[PDB]
């Protein structure tokens, strides 16, 4: 009665994948944010309370970089009912569903899942040609090859070849926090400008809900060679300069940094920022003069105004 794993006890199970939501077929771009799509139907006799089943995922499929386990939409009855809750574990990269009472009470129980997955920005660090994505279960599996790109930085042949890129990586929706990483001097070029060079992080639209006011910025220093497209890497193994360039929890409500007149060929900076967050946000980082007359910037929005994470009810 206590419950147990029942993946064996599964019939007519058909699982698949695809894209569609992607810019242009055969390619998945983060700086834009597209996804995969697990088609999954199945039938079963009877199941008790705790009974569960896995969905083995490849070492590169992520559901939500946030935390170390994300809850995924449950399976439902034709009449939208609690049928089986789901939960993705980042360490064992597999999704798990634990049935409920409804599941026990019935016999001709048929379930279906249309879950949208993404590539993992921690493993698929840089850009790839035809990556392999696979979702497995009992006997049936589900392959699909897609490319994985990250829009280039932004550059103007000014002050030597000023370059910048940025991106919202994790979005702790529950706790309401984001991680807005940014890279300075991506191309990695020796760049100078009398009157100085600066970097400023701020929310771009009158109605962003960043609240940098209560954010935590942390800066690391490195070399363009060993840096990633996704910006998600092992920072300890690189110099921490935060303390000397800027302090977290800025009163102004935006960070501004004076790098000085020169940034060396090798000198590149990773700026991780963790802020609060509300309905929607869109913010950028710059690399310009005290004015932004001459400079460069990179924005990255998120909205999802009142959505679109928990998209209850969806059929295609």
Residue numbers in the entry: 230 to 545
From the paper:
GBS strains express either one of two SRR proteins, Srr1 or Srr2. We now report that both Srr1 and Srr2 bind to a specific tandem repeat region of fibrinogen Aα chain. As was previously predicted from sequence and functional analyses, Srr1-BR and Srr2-BR each adopt an overall fold that resembles the binding regions of “microbial surface components recognizing adhesive matrix molecules” (MSCRAMMs), including the well characterized ClfA, ClfB, SdrG, and the likely MSCRAMM UafA. Like other MSCRAMMs, Srr1-BR and Srr2-BR contain two domains, termed N2 and N3, with each adopting the DE variation of the Ig fold.
